[PDB]
Amino acid sequence: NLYFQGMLTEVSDTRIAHKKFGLFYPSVSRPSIFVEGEDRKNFLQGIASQDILKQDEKSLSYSFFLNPKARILFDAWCGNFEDKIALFPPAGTREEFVNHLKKYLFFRTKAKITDMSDHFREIRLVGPETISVLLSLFDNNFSGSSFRMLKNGGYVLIHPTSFQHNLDVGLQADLFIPIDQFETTQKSLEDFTSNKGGVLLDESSYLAYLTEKGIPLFPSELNDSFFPAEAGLDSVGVSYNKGCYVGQEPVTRLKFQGHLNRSLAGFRLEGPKMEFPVTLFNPKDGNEAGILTRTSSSDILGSGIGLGYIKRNFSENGTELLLPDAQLVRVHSLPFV
């Protein structure tokens, strides 16, 4: 008998983002890494888990960068523009990500890497009216899984609407605005928000919104302890038809012959203290059943929610597990909202 009847006022404004749109200004944006040169495509194709060659001109693709054992080192959004490949690795990885690419940039490979991260400020949009907000600020047209250069400079990433376990997680757009145009774009967005009833999300409400959509993130759910298929992201981040790449054989073996021991799961719990990842225990025998990787409050669900990994024998919705202090968590369907 768990209390999932609560009022969690600190994240009540995700409701507006789910119905209209939410605006978020990250403190640390994803880096903006560009790859140029005659061998840029072959170079990146051999290290990304995604098929970069097949990708069209204004398309966006998700990829992992794996180690040789197929554990996740990074994720990135990947776009093409002119004779360049644009890569957006996770926030705070600009040096480590560039070093990882240079590890595979061998003698006489015709590719060059440039870090353009200080040229842009990131603004994020979420929710059903995201395209209408873009159409107001900018000209031409927009759709899911797209990568566009803005006429003024800068870029727009519109994520695919399907993400973990091919679930529809709604619209998400990332705007990389040239520094000198930032304060103007911000003023334009504040007017649009106030007039059209969207909401300015703070970091805790932005994270609650993403957790309500079941979205796994680097470094909590996506890191070198896990495989892309464990994370529910091999359908959007891995190609099983492409040629040689780092981690390909273990990725493929897991898929066709191996057995997935654990999988990304949603959790519901009652009502900052916990040290993540937290071990989850089976109440019957006290054995390890999974791990909880992050939590948020959800006013919509009236309880805490979280993401993590569940062993196969406990994956059914409604399965009850224990935290180390014996608070109960219940496996829940994704997305939560």
Kindly tell me which of 62 and 192 has the beta carbon lying closer to Cl ion.
62
Interaction of residue 71 with Cl ion, rule CB under 5 A: no
Kindly tell me which of 67 and 166 has the beta carbon lying closer to Cl ion.
67
Interaction of residue 67 with Cl ion, rule CB under 5 A: yes
Interaction of residue 145 with Cl ion, rule CB under 5 A: yes
Distance of CA 56 to the CA centre of its chain: 21
Report helix, strand or coil for 90.
coil
Binding mask 5-44 for Cl ion (x = CB under 5 A): ----------------------------------------
Q: Could you tell me the smallest distance in angstroms from the CB atom of residue 133 to Cl ion? A: 17
Give every CB contact of residue 9 below 8 A, 6+ residues apart in sequence.
299
For residue 274, the 8-state DSSP code is S
Q: Could you tell me the smallest distance in angstroms from the CB atom of residue 112 to Cl ion? A: 5
Binding mask 227-266 for Cl ion (x = CB under 5 A): -----------------------------------x----
Q: Could you tell me the smallest distance in angstroms from the CB atom of residue 310 to Cl ion? A: 8
Q: How far apart are CA 265 and CA 269, in angstroms?
A: 13
The values of phi and psi at residue 177, to 5°, are: -95, 130
Binding mask 188-217 for Cl ion (x = CB under 5 A): ------------------------------
- Contact region for Cl ion (CB under 5 A) — 136-144, 146-154, 167-175, 293-301? 136-144
Query: In the chain, what are the helix, strand and coil shares in percent, each to the nearest 5?
Result: 25, 30, 45
At 132, list the tokens. Answer: 């209408």
Give 19-76 as a 3 state SS string. HCCEEECCCCCCCCEEEECCCHHHHHHCCECCCCCCCCCCEEEEEEEECCCCCEEEEE
Contact predicate 57/84, CB 8 Å: no
Kindly tell me which of 199 and 228 has the beta carbon lying closer to Cl ion.
228
- Contact region for Cl ion (CB under 5 A) — 78-86, 111-119, 214-222, 325-333? 111-119
Q: Please select the residue that binds Cl ion; options are 26, 37, 92, 144, rule is CB under 5 A.
A: 144
Interaction of residue 304 with Cl ion, rule CB under 5 A: no
At 137, list the tokens. Answer: 């600020």
Report helix, strand or coil for 129.
coil
Q: Could you tell me the smallest distance in angstroms from the CB atom of residue 120 to Cl ion? A: 20
For residue 140, the 8-state DSSP code is S
Q: Pick from 229, 220, 215: which is nearest to 71 by CA?
A: 229
Q: Could you tell me the smallest distance in angstroms from the CB atom of residue 293 to Cl ion? A: 10
- Contact region for Cl ion (CB under 5 A) — 138-146, 217-225, 234-242, 315-323? 138-146
Q: Which residues bind Cl ion (CB under 5 A)?
A: 67, 112-113, 144-145, 160-161, 262, 290
